[PDB]
UniProtKB/Swiss-Prot annotation:
Superkingdom of source: Eukaryota
Main location: cytoplasm
Task performed by this protein: Taste-modifying protein; intensely sweet-tasting. It is 100000 times sweeter than sucrose on a molar basis.
Keyword vocabulary terms for this entry: Cytoplasmic vesicle, Disulfide bond, Signal, Taste-modifying protein
Family recorded in the similarity comment: Belongs to the thaumatin family.
SMART domains in the record: THN
Matches recorded under Pfam families: Thaumatin (PF00314)
InterPro entries for this protein: Osmotin/thaumatin-like_sf, Thaumatin, Thaumatin_CS
Subcellular location: Cytoplasmic vesicle
Gene Ontology CC terms, in alphabetical order: cytoplasmic vesicle
Protein name per UniProt: Thaumatin I
Organism annotation: Thaumatococcus daniellii (Katemfe)
SUPFAM superfamilies reported in the protein's UniProt record: Osmotin, thaumatin-like protein
Length: 206
């Protein structure tokens, strides 16, 4: 499957793509404002994610740091990124269908649209100014808007027991972005697409 990752932000981002235990494609690339990077993701990939990283520095070997979404200091991510990270999430060719969503469960750094480029389903978007509107206690000093689990490490925010409800913090994310997951047990906003669809992830769509 192809995923075109487009940076419409006015700032550089370092795109990342992983399934948690491996890179997808090269795993990461710098995208200056306006740049696009097309990756190939193997059919059947379960639990893939794409995200933006901000304020990164990498040496010539591809090792360094980012302020949001850092994946173990690598340009080419093999693992998931450090919150806060707006997440484009997907599982492909799962009993003949693909499943896509956006999640704020690991916080929000950069606004995102995640849409099919092929027929048969709709896209999802979280493009409100979550960083600007972020509750004081969730603001990450390193940049972005943390989720409450990251900040407070409680069973309730982290849904550790598989019993949790919405919270004042999750409701903030949900108010700003109704079509993204705001906590683990949120009413799903996952879209079913034809198996083997192709996609575009756009940072700063609006």
């Amino acid at each position: 499957a192809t995923f075109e990752i487009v940076n419409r932000c006015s700032y550089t981002v370092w795109a990342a793509a992983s399934k948690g235990d491996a890179a997808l494609d090269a795993g990461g690339r710098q995208l200056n404002s306006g740049e696009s990077w097309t990756i190939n993701v193997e059919p059947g990939t379960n639990g893939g994610k794409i995200w933006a990283r901000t304020d990164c520095y990498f040496d010539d070997s591809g090792s360094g740091i980012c302020k949001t979404g850092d994946c173990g200091g690598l340009l080419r991510c093999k693992r998931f990124g450090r919150p806060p990270t707006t997440l484009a999430e997907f599982s492909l060719n799962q009993y003949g269908k693909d499943y896509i969503d956006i999640s704020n469960i690991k916080g929000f750094n950069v606004p995102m649209n995640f849409s099919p480029t092929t027929r048969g389903c709709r896209g999802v978007r979280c493009a409100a100014d979550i960083v600007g509107q972020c509750p004081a206690k969730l603001k990450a000093p390193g940049g972005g808007c943390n989720d409450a689990c990251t900040v407070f490490q409680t069973s309730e925010y982290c849904c550790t027991t598989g019993k949790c409800g919405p919270t004042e913090y999750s409701r903030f994310f949900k108010r700003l972005c109704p079509d993204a997951f705001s906590y683990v047990l949120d009413k799903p906003t996952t879209v079913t697409c034809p198996g083997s669809s192709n996609y575009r992830v756009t940072f700063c769509p609006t």
